[PDB]
């Protein structure tokens, strides 16, 4: 057999019981999800900004980052709907650290039970403070432990074509963004949007930790995320091609632009160059750009695991706080312009 060991996993209700959502958290989640729906509908011209660390690996710095982001979110709330990237799971090209839930101690001890406790506790505190959270829904089982605290979800580029993740999205209570494929393929995401908007029936694990059959109603709050492929795809030239591609599919012509990953050619400072370009489209009148995604942290760049520096990514390189404050105002100014 190829399975070496099987260990006990706390059931979702154990985490929900230990860390129940507070009234403030519940409100943060509810208002944030509606606000995003309004933007996706068209009843709102604000820009959805999902911004924060490539991955969370330290609750202390994540808490400090949340406090600074919250101030900006309130200050720029008339132009931006700021949601913090609180990613607990990371998809790897081959092998590597999978995130805080899978291995919180970052030493391959895989204390998943500690991971879930730490993750939910952090998620709860950020929402309770009034700051909404976004995360990638990669794993099929972890959602029951955290979904109630998520205001927006992302389906990775390596799983957007996966029926299992399209199924998951069809039952999620929050808006969902589907990234285009690693090679830059737009089709997989347009297809994913159609599929996740349709009712689904499949096997899942309940809040009680038991497998069951579930039926979903389909998720209408789904959109594409442009994150580049072999070449970047954030340009007006690409945004045009994608708007037409969505209409031809009978979907609203809307996109979220991730300034990182393939769009910045994996060099963190370039996210500022993508920002400038996108802000020109927005300020120019482009009303299809519904939101943006940015990899930001307290300190710029990154560091490897293979004692840590405070507030610096251990996964993808991020822009630092100074660039973050500036990028956010750039986006807000572009929004005030596109308005007129």
């Amino acid at each position: 057999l190829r399975i070496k060991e099987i260990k006990e996993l706390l059931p979702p209700v154990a985490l929900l019981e230990k860390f129940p959502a507070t009234e403030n958290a519940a409100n943060t989640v509810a208002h944030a999800r509606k606000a995003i729906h309004k933007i996706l509908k068209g009843n709102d011209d604000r820009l959805l900004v999902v911004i924060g660390p490539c991955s969370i690996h330290d609750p202390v710095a994540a808490k400090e980052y949340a406090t600074r982001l919250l101030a900006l979110r309130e200050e720029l709330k008339d132009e931006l709907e700021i949601v913090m990237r609180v990613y607990f799971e990371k998809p790897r090209t081959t092998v590597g650290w999978k995130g805080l839930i899978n291995d919180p101690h970052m030493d391959n001890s895989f204390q998943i039970n500690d991971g879930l406790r730490i993750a939910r506790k952090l998620l709860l505190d950020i929402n309770d403070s009034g700051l909404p959270a976004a995360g990638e829904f990669l794993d099929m089982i972890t959602p029951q432990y955290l979904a109630d605290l998520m205001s927006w979800g992302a389906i990775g580029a390596r799983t957007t074509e996966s029926q299992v993740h399209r199924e998951l999205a069809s039952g999620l209570s929050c808006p969902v963004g589907f990234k285009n494929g690693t090679d830059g393929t737009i089709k997989v995401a347009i297809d994913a949007i159609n599929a996740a908007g349709a009712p689904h029936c499949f096997l899942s694990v309940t809040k009680w930790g038991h497998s069951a059959i579930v039926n979903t109603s389909g998720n209408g709050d789904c959109h594409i995320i442009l994150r580049g492929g072999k070449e970047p795809n954030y340009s007006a030239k690409h945004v045009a091609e994608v708007k037409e591609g969505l209409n031809k599919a009978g979907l609203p012509a809307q996109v979220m632009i991730d300034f990182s990953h393939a769009n910045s050619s994996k060099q963190f400072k370039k996210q500022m160059d993508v920002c400038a370009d996108v802000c020109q489209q927005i300020a120019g009148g482009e009303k299809a750009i519904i939101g943006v995604m940015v990899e930001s942290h307290l300190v710029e760049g990154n560091q490897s695991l293979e004692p840590l520096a405070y507030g610096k990514s251990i996964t993808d390189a991020c822009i630092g706080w100074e660039d973050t404050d500036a990028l956010l105002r750039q986006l807000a100014n572009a929004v005030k312009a596109r308005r007129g």
Copy 2:
């Protein structure tokens, strides 16, 4: 909330107790795995052939096929290691019938518990008769119900890059084939193979239907499956590149070619052409092609979902049985030649 209803699901242990493995089936799966391994390790010059319906949606028409294919398996056994495509789950481009397990009655009634019973019984019978089975591992929970009766599995083109599927593969007891991406990307498959060969720790459901933390050891019996992209990729040209690309990744230069889907340009008919070419390469001495995959049925073509025509696919179009017998012999001959 976007969750309509939640219903009871029989735990794996319930399907295993009601439909246990017969001594035959148990040996039919074990021998086949050892054989497939033996081939991947280069201690066998035979060719793995994964052939059968795109999808199983009729145990009757399915049993007749298993019946006919089993003969050819014994007949062409010195050249070919024939394994039937017993696919219970299907990934759709957008939406559609997901397979026997998800909606066996094909009426969107989704009687999955009957689906699992029906599926494991059929799989058990085919295995009992001596014919190995293959399928695509799509779902993360269904594996516990059927895995003990699978001799080879495949990760779909749309899920080869998916970390949850590479995790699943690292813990499966049978050889696994990873299809190249829909656009034809080879790297996703090469990366999947390296990932699947390493140990993993993740969440999964046990035989008791309970989520748990699992540690796998990694699966070395993995390989790529060329299934085409924007353009077909079965020619000696693509094989040569993919052979070079594997070495770069420090992996054995071996491949499986699927004659259908993108390689046949979605024309079951064209599988015979692809067959010729592959036979030419094998006949020429190409020792890299360690296996092939063909989508066939009793009656060629395909139909869509009202009563249905018999033995005709309800998903991807397949070649009929006549072509199958000939195709299987074309391949067996090439093997003898290559030898």
Copy 3:
């Protein structure tokens, strides 16, 4: 977990119900018998319920024969007797010792409980499928889910009649239940139990899926006392009179079942024939209160402490098959006379 040495996996009830589902006949056997016993307890049938068989099942082979022999008599004496076979898989001990077939089927302290459950339900399904109803002591709180659907009548042991956990269980069983008087001979505990089991209860229990849950029961109106003796026998007309007045005072139907064995036969199997004579006279005399009896019989007579003599009890001593034939006929005549 200081005093917990080990924890092992247990098959959920659905696993046993899936492997061994109840045949159409088995279900009919159970439904009719329960209905019949209900009719007798409601005083709308002058027949006598007769729970007879071994002290404990320890060999499916002998038990299947015993069952075949009894079925002949059940069909024969069917107009005066409602014969139900004692198929006891759990035995409560005074201190320690063998707890029965489910707990340790291999009778070698290997506690292969999962096997015990397979054997027990299979044997119980067989007996029922043939048309012979079954009776057993419900001792464990978790085993009922695996066998209850095949039980027509159940007993609560003298050592657990006063226990609230057993009274709750009884309140939700789908079959009639008999409560034995205390081991010291105390009647009140059984009277209190009938009243307790007749009311609705809410308590924790394990579902068919093997998960704990909150359960609400409706209450069981089909409960009655079983006179099994104490410091001395309590089967005489004098005791019967006293128990009937006791039941009336407690607002319960004045009826009883008399166990010819255990404390009433002073632990001497042969003495069961004497109790039979007495009870027969009572029934012949017009005693409508004696609604049933319980007898410990087997293929052969006696007891043997754990080769094993085939068809011989390994727990309490029983009367042989001949005395059994004589006993069942003696009872049927008495019933004929009463009527």
Copy 4:
């Protein structure tokens, strides 16, 4: 089926995760269990005293009671090992309220999940303050939710002869007292102690709320509790018969004497008469009485839920209890008797 409905039950881990033992709560339990073991082994001459309400029906009054009891626990600790009765499960003669866990709101809404949360939170608070807790282990599934916070347990008179309860005790991490039968029968408790001291294999539910097969090691920290029968059984005469009976069965010759229930002829103030008699036995040299049990509350007597009459605060809704004043005097008498025995 006579099964009206089935509802979801939080698994033990959910309660354990929501209400984990604090360092002080875990220390209270480990120290109490060790202290009781020492008394049972005859390595300590103090008297174990399990005292408190017949049943817990109100967390507020339970905590006010625990504060007063803790003060005495600390003051008389040289003579007494005081443990509070925190009983969440009640076995009824026929039907009735089964305790806080089964029906916390005492109105037949049976909110068991809430009951479990309320019970464990109250137990954690009492243990964290340094006061150990005792309870009756009646139900087969509730133990997993609360056992880690129990320092001593009882098997009641109606279940001492039950195999499923003897099996449970054989696997419990705390010392366990077995009450004699309701009719006065001593043998069932002697057999129970012997049965519980042996390893067993049976079916139970895990902390994950799943049924499983379990193997226990046997529990050697078990003893008898004399609680009366048709006649009280606390007198020297009975204590001698029982010590001789345990000896004959090869068990330590020792007993806990419950001053209540049938030993007080169900007259709550008679517990004071039992106390006086037991104190004279202890002060006169009796060493085999290793513990006593007392039904005590803030206010004396009892009240009924079936009278519609509003509930008085700190007054039992099941068996009648002595009030606080008598409790303080009784505890001091016992400590004084122990001091006298030590001489």
